[PDB]
Amino acid sequence: DMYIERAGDITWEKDAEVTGNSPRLDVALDESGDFSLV
């Protein structure tokens, strides 16, 4: 069976690790909710 457990507050932290780039992609969204590169 599927159950849920609380994992914390919804909070912005100041001591946050910062990573990742900011790509701009041409994508398409089909009926099944799937994204695809255009």
Partner: protein
């Protein structure tokens, strides 16, 4: 059962596995559709019955309508409140990329955490949830980029 606002792990029993993550806000549990696929959830003693869902948005809410309506401002950095399987909830800050669709631009974060992190909330500087993590594309080799998926109140 657990009414409290906050971020939640969604778990399954075969052993036990974390298949995704969700957000409880104003008595409604928000997660991504592909995580639960419309299956009812257990919250301790009580049960969360599906209320609304949409496969194209890849979203689903429980006990009530979709409550998250905040959106990315298209400029500021955001924070992925990733709740990885077996790991403490952690905030990862990033400057969102952009999904350019024929129906407009969607915020997208270039972070790649395990599948069980699907449904983890993406927050703005105010601490408001602007979307859920776990639906996007793949560029080059293993480079997953998730859209900032938000519903409508």
């Amino acid at each position: 059962g657990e009414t409290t606002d906050g971020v939640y792990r969604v778990m399954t029993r075969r052993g036990s596995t974390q298949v995704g993550v969700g957000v409880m806000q104003e008595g409604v549990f928000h997660t991504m559709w592909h995580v639960t696929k419309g299956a009812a959830l257990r919250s301790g003693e009580g049960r969360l019955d599906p209320y609304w869902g949409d496969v194209k948005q890849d979203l689903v809410s429980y006990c009530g309508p979709w409550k998250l309506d905040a959106a990315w401002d298209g400029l500021s950095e955001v924070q992925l409140l990733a709740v990885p399987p077996g790991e403490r909830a952690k905030n990862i800050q990033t400057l969102p990329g952009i999904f350019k669709t024929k129906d407009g631009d969607i915020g997208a974060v270039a972070l790649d955490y395990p599948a069980g992190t699907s449904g983890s909330p993406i927050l703005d500087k105010s601490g408001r949830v602007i979307g859920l993590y776990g639906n996007g594309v793949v560029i080059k080799n293993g480079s997953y980029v998730s859209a900032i998926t938000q519903g409508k109140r």
